[PDB]
Amino acid sequence: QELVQYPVEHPDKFLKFGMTPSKGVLFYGPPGCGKTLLAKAIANECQANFISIKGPELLTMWFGESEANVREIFDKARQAAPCVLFFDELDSIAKARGGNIGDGGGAADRVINQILTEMDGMSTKKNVFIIGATNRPDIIDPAILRPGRLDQLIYIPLPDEKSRVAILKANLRKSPVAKDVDLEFLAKMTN
Amino acid sequence: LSTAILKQKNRPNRLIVDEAINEDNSVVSLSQPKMDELQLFRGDTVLLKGKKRREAVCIVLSDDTCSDEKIRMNRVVRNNLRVRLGDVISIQPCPDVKYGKRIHVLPIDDTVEGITGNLFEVYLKPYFLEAYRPIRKGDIFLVRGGMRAVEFKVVETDPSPYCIVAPDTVIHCEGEPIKREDEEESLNEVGYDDIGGCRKQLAQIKEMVELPLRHPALFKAIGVKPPRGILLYGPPGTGKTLIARAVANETGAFFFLINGPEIMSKLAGESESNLRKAFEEAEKNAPAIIFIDELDAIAPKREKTHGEVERRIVSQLLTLMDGLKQRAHVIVMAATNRPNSIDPALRRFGRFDREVDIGIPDATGRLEILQIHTKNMKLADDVDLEQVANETHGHVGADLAALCSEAALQAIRKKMDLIDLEDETIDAEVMNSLAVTMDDFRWALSQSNPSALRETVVEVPQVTWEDIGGLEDVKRELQELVQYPVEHPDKFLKFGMTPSKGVLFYGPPGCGKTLLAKAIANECQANFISIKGPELLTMWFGESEANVREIFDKARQAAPCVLFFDELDSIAKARGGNIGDGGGAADRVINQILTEMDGMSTKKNVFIIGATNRPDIIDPAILRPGRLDQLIYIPLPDEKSRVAILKANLRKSPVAKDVDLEFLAKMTNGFSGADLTEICQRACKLAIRESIESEIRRERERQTNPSAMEVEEDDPVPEIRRDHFEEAMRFARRSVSDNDIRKYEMFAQTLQQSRGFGSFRFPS
Amino acid sequence: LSTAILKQKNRPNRLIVDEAINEDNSVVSLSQPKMDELQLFRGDTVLLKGKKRREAVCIVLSDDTCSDEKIRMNRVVRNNLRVRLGDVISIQPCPD
Amino acid sequence: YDDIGGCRKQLAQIKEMVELPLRHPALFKAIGVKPPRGILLYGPPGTGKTLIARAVANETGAFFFLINGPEIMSKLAGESESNLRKAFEEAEKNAPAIIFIDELDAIAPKREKTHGEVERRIVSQLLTLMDGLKQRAHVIVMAATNRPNSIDPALRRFGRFDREVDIGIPDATGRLEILQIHTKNMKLADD
Amino acid sequence: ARGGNIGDGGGAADRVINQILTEMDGMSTKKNVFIIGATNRPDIIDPAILRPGRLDQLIYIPLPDEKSRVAILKANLRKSPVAKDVDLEFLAKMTN
């Protein structure tokens, strides 16, 4: 909340102090653990747009032109503020190049580099918040985990006991379920 | 020596105009020495000379009731002079003390209507019957012959400079109604005061031009060669035609504008006729100017040029420009956006050699532009244009007009409750009780896409030394290389030393390797071009040699620059690094930097500073004499520098009184220069949280007693308020571990121990 | 008054569509104070508001038999006002 | 006005930009603020853009003039340019007008598509007419294209097509409005 | 700049030195053009140029010994007004 909502609902507080709003987060956790449902859930709170940017399409850029669409993707979010641009699978290029590639190449990959050019050339006044998500939080380029860019890392753990009850009651909503089913029980053995 | 050209060169008869309490147009207020200085004979007519030759005169009398350097008139003469209060006019009797022969007046409908009568009987006989109310030939003046403002035009007049119109002057009464806005058509002649963000780039125009026009005799006879082409260029929308009109109309020079697309919007074999008929009457009239606007549209590079009928206009333009000879006294100036876009054949000598460079306005250019644009709006008290000028980053001299527009529209939209949708009875107070606040300006600022956020910014930075503190040796050894070779050049000729052309910093990441470059650039008032890592690594992923040349050519036209190539090693570590592959650092880009760093004359004062997080994996070809020569090692901040960094981060935000920065910096030992900026932000997100929680808790609280009427405490948390740093210091992470600062100390110690001739001592 | 232009001026005499069973194409069933608020005398014609300047006017009579909230009209004028039953129609006299 | 669906978010922006300059000419001229010299709508083809222009202009009391794209680029070389003039010439004579140059990416493509000379003489004839507009004429041009970068970049310069709305694909609740517009004649069953 | 005995295998040819060979051979000796090279790594140099008909011999330029250092110092100290009691014969004798 304090990264997507407060810099929107109370922008005057951010002027009383000299604090400057953050422009990035980086979720990382076990794959398939509701890392996408958290971008939408916060985007639903502050009533913001939500542009989703997946793996299999970023990796398309690395197999040809780059740097002519990453410019346009951002300029789409700039005309539709406040967005929550969600670069899913930021490591997708890295593990598709070798995962510590043998020939030597360290971090730069012609596409993650281009995001840096746009991310810096974006005044914080526009309320565009970039959220990444990775399952391999080490091969990610160390040039984005630096102040001024995606700053921190939030670790999304596996659902524990209370989410699993809620996760089940979300999938079983459209399907007529029996009244003697105990989701309070089925969520207590699946551990 | 460079911008000394705007000297005023005062004369004794310079008096600042003022207001007169009498409707009489022929009131003069003088200093007592002024009456008897120019021998001002009472009752005669003295010539008043404004700007753009906008003039109107008055009878000189013994009325010294005003101050010594002020003169009182009413709206007629002052406005016909077209100068405000704060502009002097040389009151001087020109011997043309004469009456007009025949004048023709052009009435303006809204001014004349009300009391109309007959033109002669009501306004021309008695308002001019021996009343010594003089006017100038060819003006649009004001007649206070009725109940309110009544305006006419001067058309015909025997004394061209100035005259008194009498009943001897027979005035034709077939005048036609004119418009208030018709005056604006002629007044589209811009004065000199209407350019902002070009305090510097206008001195260059005042020196290249304005000398060879106001005195053809001087530069013609001495045999010096005036320019015959100026190529202004900058980002689109910085108002260049405005600059051309100012420079032209300000020096009394006919200004003929050739439009860009309006040339090729015409038939094949017809555009050439237009170019010829432009260059052939510009040479005809007077010392003139041609402003070939949007040049890159009628002379692109060869590749964008496709047909032959389009490579004929270019050749016609060339043969017309080489038809300029010293008799013609005509000066052409064009306007592209970058020097590359124009056809290279034009830059050859004799056509478009000298090349001024308008650019993005800087942190005070925006302020002054905003003051230009907002002299018609009715600003509320709490508007602080010095504040909003700091916010607008990428905007140019055109986006600020749109920002003012959006703010005014935001106010006119907050015109909401009680004026009917089709209410034509918009009260005049609506137009004169507008209150544009900071709310409207921030609203507008949040909505405007800036035009030119993708341009390198060449402007003096606003950092000082005590934002770093300490570094008492790097301070001197960086002075001796950027300040001495600028402020004291003669020493470098008295001895034989050639100035160095580079320094290579190296140290742990985030230690002030940028604040040092900005600080030293500030010290000697030198522009500061910064080239970050991605802006190079992008070059390594495609073309090279097409931007690096551009970077150095940009640096050349802003001497003295301090070009700062941050992360020089970026390619070397993005190409494996220290393991990599087969390569002797072998870079497609760095080699280009070497090529341009050799072909660079030392006399131009362009000092190149690098910065590498790793001092060894870099190419050894730069660390060779003649290029970036010596290495400065920037250590981690130690004691005074940490206090300075904390007090420079906490200078924007309200801090408490007992916050002991002198202790906080005394405790945190191994902290970077960018890990004390998260003990100073994460100490503010623990206050934004607390204030924005207390507000909501108070709001939900008082719904228990909505009738209390004693609510809304002024401030729950006004202050960063120690016991926040107590908590924010729980998320303080040392960036550089002690196992990684060894690699730099055990390098710097190796630069030493290869030195020390010590016991060296000349004999006797 | 420097924060005011967005007024639409909703009126106390705004008349909403009500169905009629009459066949006369310019008879209006109005509120009782309709002749009274603007002092609307008999002998003139009002300018009923539709959309797109595509309107249809009536002869206004002292026929105030309707209620104070709506107007009873046939198909002709309301539809020839180029507004379906469900569009705002405002009453205003026209001295033409 | 109410025959447009799924555009309530963007059609609000056209409300602020156009009707205030058009139904209150004096207020702009009095305060001196300047109305836009041209809007540039853009979105995927067939989202009903040539209707929005009629919507805005048919209910604000403003003469409307439609210039088609293929209508211009299909006449004799040298006759098309005349038709552009006899449109701007005629519109300026009339009331506050709205010229809607539909299919603008056909009469002014990227240069990289323009190859003939007469193909680049219409574009210039357009630009001189556009910048020939000033506050006297009281005309507000507005265009339509599918993607913003598929237009000649010389048009976006200031004074021609400065500001640029973006009609987008209708959202999940926008469609419900459209379907209730195209089925107000059908006899839908109760189910 | 290619690897210094590059790993992938490439032995001598580098697309540029080869061109220098092609032009060097196609140039009659009558024209008085003398080609002087200079290298710091005199083993990785392509063995196809150290062949008769091309750059033939090698001359090893040693470090300055005692007199060349005096001359170098007096050449560098020419434009700068020096004191008259400076002993370059000593400063060139310690720097070894």
UniProtKB/Swiss-Prot annotation, chain D:
Q: What is its main location?
A: cytoplasm
One GO biological process term is: regulation of aerobic respiration
Q: What's the reported outcome of changing residue 112 to A? A: Does not affect methylation by VCPKMT
Q: What is the effect of changing residue 110 to A?
A: Does not affect methylation by VCPKMT
Q: Residue positions of the PTM N6,N6,N6-trimethyllysine?
A: 113
The protein's PTM annotation reads: Phosphorylated by tyrosine kinases in response to T-cell antigen receptor activation. Phosphorylated in mitotic cells. ISGylated.
Where does the record say this protein resides?
A: Cytoplasm, Cytosol; Endoplasmic reticulum; Nucleus; Cytoplasm, Stress granule
CC terms in the record's Gene Ontology section: ATPase complex; azurophil granule lumen; ciliary basal body; cytoplasm; cytoplasmic stress granule; cytosol; Derlin-1 retrotranslocation complex; endoplasmic reticulum
One annotated GO molecular function is:
K48-linked polyubiquitin modification-dependent protein binding
User: Which UniProt keywords are listed?
Assistant: Acetylation, Amyotrophic lateral sclerosis, ATP-binding, Autophagy, Charcot-Marie-Tooth disease, Cytoplasm, Disease variant, DNA damage, DNA repair, Endoplasmic reticulum, Hydrolase, Isopeptide bond, Lipid-binding, Methylation, Neurodegeneration, Neuropathy, Nucleotide-binding, Nucleus, Phosphoprotein, Transport, Ubl conjugation, Ubl conjugation pathway
Which stretch is the leader sequence?
A: none
Q: Where does ATP 1 bind?
A: 45-51, 146, 182
What does the UniProt record report as the effect of altering residue 113 to L/Q/R in this chain? Answer: Abolishes methylation by VCPKMT
Q: What is known of its domains?
A: The PIM (PUB-interaction motif) motif mediates interaction with the PUB domain of RNF31.
Known function? Necessary for the fragmentation of Golgi stacks during mitosis and for their reassembly after mitosis. Involved in the formation of the transitional endoplasmic reticulum (tER). The transfer of membranes from the endoplasmic reticulum to the Golgi apparatus occurs via 50-70 nm transition vesicles which derive from part-rough, part-smooth transitional elements of the endoplasmic reticulum (tER). Vesicle budding from the tER is an ATP-dependent process.
Q: Which disease is it linked to?
A: Inclusion body myopathy with early-onset Paget disease with or without frontotemporal dementia 1: An autosomal dominant disease characterized by disabling muscle weakness clinically resembling to limb girdle muscular dystrophy, osteolytic bone lesions consistent with Paget disease, and premature frontotemporal dementia. Clinical features show incomplete penetrance. Frontotemporal dementia and/or amyotrophic lateral sclerosis 6: A neurodegenerative disorder characterized by frontotemporal dementia and/or amyotrophic lateral sclerosis in affected individuals. There is high intrafamilial variation. Frontotemporal dementia (FTD) is characterized by frontal and temporal lobe atrophy associated with neuronal loss, gliosis, and dementia. Patients exhibit progressive changes in social, behavioral, and/or language function.
Q: Per the similarity annotation, which family is this? A: Belongs to the AAA ATPase family.
Record protein name field: Transitional endoplasmic reticulum ATPase
Q: Which gene encodes it?
A: VCP
UniProtKB/Swiss-Prot annotation, chain E:
N6-acetyllysine-modified residues are: 84
Q: Transmembrane residues, as ranges?
A: none
Q: How is it modified after translation?
A: Phosphorylated by tyrosine kinases in response to T-cell antigen receptor activation. Phosphorylated in mitotic cells. ISGylated.
Task: Name its cellular compartments.
Answer: Cytoplasm, Cytosol; Endoplasmic reticulum; Nucleus; Cytoplasm, Stress granule
**Chain positions with N6-succinyllysine modification:** 84
Q: Which domain of life is it from?
A: Eukaryota
Q: Indicate the family of this protein.
A: Belongs to the AAA ATPase family.
Question: What job does this protein perform?
Answer: Necessary for the fragmentation of Golgi stacks during mitosis and for their reassembly after mitosis. Involved in the formation of the transitional endoplasmic reticulum (tER). The transfer of membranes from the endoplasmic reticulum to the Golgi apparatus occurs via 50-70 nm transition vesicles which derive from part-rough, part-smooth transitional elements of the endoplasmic reticulum (tER). Vesicle budding from the tER is an ATP-dependent process.
Give the quaternary structure: Homohexamer. Forms a ring-shaped particle of 12.5 nm diameter, that displays 6-fold radial symmetry. Part of a ternary complex containing STX5A, NSFL1C and VCP. NSFL1C forms a homotrimer that binds to one end of a VCP homohexamer. The complex binds to membranes enriched in phosphatidylethanolamine-containing lipids and promotes Golgi membrane fusion. Binds to a heterodimer of NPLOC4 and UFD1, binding to this heterodimer inhibits Golgi-membrane fusion. Interaction with VCIP135 leads to dissociation of the complex via ATP hydrolysis by VCP.
Domain remark in the UniProt entry: The PIM (PUB-interaction motif) motif mediates interaction with the PUB domain of RNF31.
Q: Which disease is it linked to?
A: Inclusion body myopathy with early-onset Paget disease with or without frontotemporal dementia 1: An autosomal dominant disease characterized by disabling muscle weakness clinically resembling to limb girdle muscular dystrophy, osteolytic bone lesions consistent with Paget disease, and premature frontotemporal dementia. Clinical features show incomplete penetrance.
Q: Supply the name of the protein.
A: Transitional endoplasmic reticulum ATPase
| Organism of this sequence | Homo sapiens
